[PDB]
Amino acid sequence: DPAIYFKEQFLDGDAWTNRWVESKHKSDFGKFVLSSGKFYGDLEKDKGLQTSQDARFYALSAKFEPFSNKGQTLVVQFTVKHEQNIDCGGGYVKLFPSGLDQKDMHGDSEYNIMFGPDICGPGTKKVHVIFNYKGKNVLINKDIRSKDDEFTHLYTLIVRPDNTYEVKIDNSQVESGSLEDDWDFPDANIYAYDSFAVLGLDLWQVKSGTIFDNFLITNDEAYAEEFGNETWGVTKAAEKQMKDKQDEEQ
């Protein structure tokens, strides 16, 4: 049986607010709203969290029963849709250990892993993969290109107990190697963390309108691939046809 540590598909309406916490660290964080956007694969299935305010910081997080990846695989996966045609704005997640105050979470709150696309003008169009190791946040030595169009894309990070990793975009490998070689941190336990307890969205955006959906944290690579195909894989073609429709009808 795959261990599902966390899963969020926003399938139950306004009830998501019972599972996600707004940080109060700042008084003027932008608001996340539940939305399937202007075009979608399915009105209900493609409901996710959308940034609703221009030129704001965002800080929202969801807790889950704490776990450790010691001795097993860790997979983190979600969809990002920059439906607005984004100029500058984050689309990554952070994983936090136990002890985070969700009501006070912010950009400098200490995290274990940060992963996902970041866009900031043409000069920043990169997928971050950051490991906190011995008091330092270490950025991956590799250039992974992020998606910049208006459509929904799947982002997957896989971390293995043999100190290997893989990054997938749209369920397809884009980068692969070992933690020893692709970060400037030999330690057999680089991969492992004593606890994960919270998934956070800590973002700055200029033009807002990005939608996040289909969050998954699991110990099973095969299950993540399947879940990805059943979520993003299903959204992909349907949403393209409805975008094609809207252009032709205009």
Ligand X SMILES: OC[C@H]1O[C@H](O[C@@H]2[C@H](O)[C@@H](O[C@@H]3[C@@H](O[C@H]4[C@@H](O)[C@H](O)[C@@H](CO)O[C@@H]4O)O[C@H](CO)[C@@H](O)[C@@H]3O)O[C@H](CO)[C@H]2O)[C@H](O)[C@@H](O)[C@@H]1O
Burial of 38-69, coded b for 16+ CB within 10 Å and e otherwise, reads ebbbeeebbbbbbbebeebbbbbbbbbeebeb
Q: Which is nearer to ligand X, 138 or 192 (CB)?
A: 138
Q: How far is the CB of 149 from ligand X (least distance, A)?
A: 17
Region label for 218, one of left (φ > 0), alpha (ψ between -120 and 50) or beta (otherwise):
beta
**Binder to ligand X among 62, 88, 234, 238 (CB under 6 A)?**
88
Q: How far is the CB of 168 from ligand X (least distance, A)?
A: 21
CA angle, corner 49, sides to 63 and 83, nearest 5?
145
Question: Per rule CB under 6 A, is residue 176 in the interface with ligand X?
Answer: no
Residue 101 marked ligand-binding: no
Token pair of 205 as six digits: 């955006």
Residue 9 marked ligand-binding: yes
DSSP state of 18: G
Across-strand partners of 114? 94, 130
Q: How far is the CB of 143 from ligand X (least distance, A)?
A: 14
- Is residue 73 a contact partner of residue 165, using CB atoms and an 8 Å limit? no
Q: Which of Ca ion, ligand X, none sits in contact with 9, Cβ below 5 to 8 A by type?
A: Ca ion
Residue 70 marked ligand-binding: no
Residues that bind Ca ion in the complex, under the rule CB under 5 A: 9-10, 47-48, 213
Please report, as residue ranges, which positions from 91 to 120 form the binding site for ligand X (by CB under 6 A).
107, 114, 118, 120
What does the per-residue mask of binding to ligand X show for 44-83, with x meaning CB under 6 A? -------------x--------------------------
Residue 45 marked ligand-binding: yes
Taking the CA atoms of 211, 214, 215 and 219 in sequence, report the sign of the dihedral they define. Answer: negative
Token pair of 219 as six digits: 């110990």
Question: Per rule CB under 6 A, is residue 209 in the interface with ligand X?
Answer: no
What is the DSSP annotation of 60-77? Answer: EEEEEEEE--TTS-EEEE
How far is 141 from 143, CA to CA, in rounded Å?
Answer: 7
Question: Per rule CB under 6 A, is residue 137 in the interface with ligand X?
Answer: yes
Residue 111 marked ligand-binding: yes
Question: Per rule CB under 6 A, is residue 89 in the interface with ligand X?
Answer: yes
Q: Which of ligand X, Ca ion, none sits in contact with 107, Cβ below 5 to 8 A by type?
A: ligand X
Q: How far is the CB of 15 from Ca ion (least distance, A)?
A: 13
CA angle, corner 33, sides to 100 and 238, nearest 5?
115
Question: Which residues participate in the annotated binding site for an alpha-D-glucoside?
Answer: 92, 94, 111, 118, 202
State the residues that interact with ligand X by CB under 6 A. 57, 88-90, 107, 114, 118, 120, 124, 137, 202-204
Question: Which residues participate in the annotated binding site?
Answer: 9, 45, 47, 92, 94, 111, 118, 202, 213
